[PDB]
């Protein structure tokens, strides 16, 4: 039957069904308020598919320069077409090569750059604010978003939308890689996944992408997403709570010593935005310092609500295409506060 939610992370993660149902507050505001990320499936059955698809972007704005970057090892491609990225999405035999004749795993730089979606991609951007769930905290004049509404004392998020688009990691090796390495925002946030691609040449790559969860501490419930209702897993998210940051900074300040970094001991590990958190690592976190996050496998149409001052990373499964608004809420405008 329809029900109105469920719980993944063996109930430590909200999973809210119907977007658009005027009664999500309520479940919503208990869980939000303690801290917690929250998931909402379905958004993609509310947008226009066409809009979202990697050929229109190609075709539309496959002329404009930009700088691309290789996952693998952070390395910047300098000065190329949008369309060399996009052609290559799903086809592996059209991606930019490594010195070493490889498919590059490459991600997409600061596109479309600063505040220019709105500008660039008005129907698209018409297409995502009407149908974000929870509106009177995710849209720009909800009521319950204070982002236009607070004083200079506060730091105010920039204006939105914001793209993620990257290739999936592949290998054995790219388990242990970040699509995005840990870092916080000082904003709350919902970033929706718009398309999923998987791709062909080298397609039967179902296999790696299985350890990849299981490996990620992704919890039964999830894993039955994927083989009982066939829906398309696009990416694997670890988040850990706001109150829980500096234990992480101080794992990783003492990694950083073992693998001889020299940095003064008060240097800031998640705002260098310089790590993924691997198995070994998120054990070490657990058994050393008592911290644990919720693995989290977002899927074609999931909203993922990541609250303000969450340490949060991201890796790509397969090929994504994710847009981002951020917001205010007032249970966590402490976090953007600029005193005490
Ligand atoms: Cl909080
Ligand atoms: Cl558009
Ligand atoms: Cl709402
Ligand atoms: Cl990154
Ligand atoms: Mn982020």
Same mark, same amino acid.
């Given at each position: 039957?329809?029900?109105?939610? +469920?719980?993944? @992370?063996?109930?430590?993660?909200?999973?809210?069904?119907?977007?658009?149902?005027?009664?999500?507050?309520?479940?919503?505001?208990?869980?939000?308020?303690? $801290?917690? %990320?929250?998931?909402?499936?379905?958004?993609?059955?509310?947008?226009?598919?066409?809009?979202?698809?990697? =050929?229109?972007? +190609?075709? *539309?704005?496959?002329?404009?320069?930009?700088?691309?970057?290789? @996952?693998?090892?952070?390395?910047?491609?300098? !000065?190329?077409?949008?369309?060399?990225?996009?052609? $290559?999405?799903?086809?592996?035999?059209?991606?930019?090569? +490594?010195?070493?004749?490889?498919?590059?795993?490459?991600?997409?730089?600061?596109?479309?750059?600063?505040?220019?979606?709105? !500008?660039?991609?008005?129907?698209?951007? *018409?297409?995502?604010?009407?149908?974000? %769930?929870?509106? =009177?905290?995710?849209?720009?004049?909800?009521?319950?978003?204070?982002?236009?509404?607070?004083?200079?004392?506060?730091?105010?998020?920039?204006?939105?939308?914001?793209?993620?688009?990257?290739?999936?990691?592949?290998?054995?090796?790219?388990?242990?890689?970040?699509?995005?390495?840990?870092?916080?925002?000082? +904003?709350?946030?919902?970033?929706?996944?718009?398309?999923? $691609?998987?791709?062909?040449?080298?397609?039967?790559?179902?296999?790696?992408?299985?350890?990849?969860?299981?490996?990620?501490?992704?919890?039964?419930?999830?894993?039955?997403?994927?083989? !009982?209702?066939?829906?398309?897993?696009?990416?694997?998210?670890?988040?850990?709570?706001?109150?829980?940051? =500096?234990?992480?900074?101080?794992?990783?300040?003492?990694?950083?010593? *073992?693998?001889?970094?020299?940095?003064?001991?008060?240097?800031?590990?998640?705002?260098?935005?310089?790590?993924?958190?691997?198995?070994?690592?998120?054990?070490?976190?657990?058994?050393?310092?008592?911290?644990?996050?919720?693995?989290?496998?977002?899927?074609?149409?999931?909203?993922?609500?990541?609250?303000?001052?969450?340490?949060?990373?991201?890796?790509?499964?397969?090929? @994504?295409?994710?847009?981002?608004?951020?917001?205010?809420?007032?249970?966590?405008?402490?976090?953007?506060?600029?005193?005490?």
């Amino acid at each position: 039957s329809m029900t109105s939610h +469920s719980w993944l @992370c063996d109930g430590r993660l909200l999973c809210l069904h119907d977007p658009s149902n005027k009664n999500n507050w309520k479940i919503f505001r208990e869980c939000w308020k303690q $801290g917690q %990320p929250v998931l909402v499936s379905g958004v993609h059955k509310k947008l226009k598919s066409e809009l979202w698809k990697p =050929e229109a972007f +190609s075709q *539309e704005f496959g002329d404009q320069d930009v700088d691309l970057v290789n @996952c693998r090892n952070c390395a910047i491609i300098s !000065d190329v077409k949008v369309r060399d990225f996009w052609d $290559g999405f799903e086809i592996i035999c059209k991606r930019l090569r +490594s010195e070493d004749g490889q498919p590059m795993v490459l991600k997409l730089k600061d596109w479309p750059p600063g505040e220019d979606f709105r !500008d660039m991609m008005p129907t698209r951007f *018409e297409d995502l604010m009407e149908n974000l %769930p929870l509106p =009177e905290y995710t849209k720009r004049d909800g009521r319950l978003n204070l982002a236009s509404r607070l004083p200079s004392y506060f730091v105010r998020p920039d204006l939105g939308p914001k793209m993620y688009n990257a290739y999936g990691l592949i290998t054995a090796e790219d388990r242990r890689v970040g699509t995005t390495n840990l870092h916080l925002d000082v +904003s709350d946030a919902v970033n929706v996944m718009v398309y999923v $691609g998987i791709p062909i040449g080298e397609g039967a790559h179902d296999e790696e992408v299985l350890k990849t969860i299981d490996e990620g501490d992704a919890d039964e419930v999830t894993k039955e997403r994927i083989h !009982d209702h066939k829906e398309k897993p696009g990416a694997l998210w670890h988040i850990y709570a706001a109150k829980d940051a =500096e234990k992480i900074r101080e794992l990783l300040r003492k990694v950083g010593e *073992e693998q001889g970094q020299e940095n003064p001991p008060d240097h800031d590990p998640i705002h260098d935005q310089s790590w993924y958190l691997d198995q070994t690592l998120r054990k070490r976190l657990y058994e050393e310092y008592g911290v644990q996050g919720w693995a989290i496998v977002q899927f074609l149409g999931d909203a993922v609500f990541i609250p303000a001052g969450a340490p949060h990373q991201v890796h790509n499964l397969y090929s @994504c295409i994710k847009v981002a608004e951020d917001f205010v809420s007032p249970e966590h405008v402490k976090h953007c506060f600029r005193l005490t």
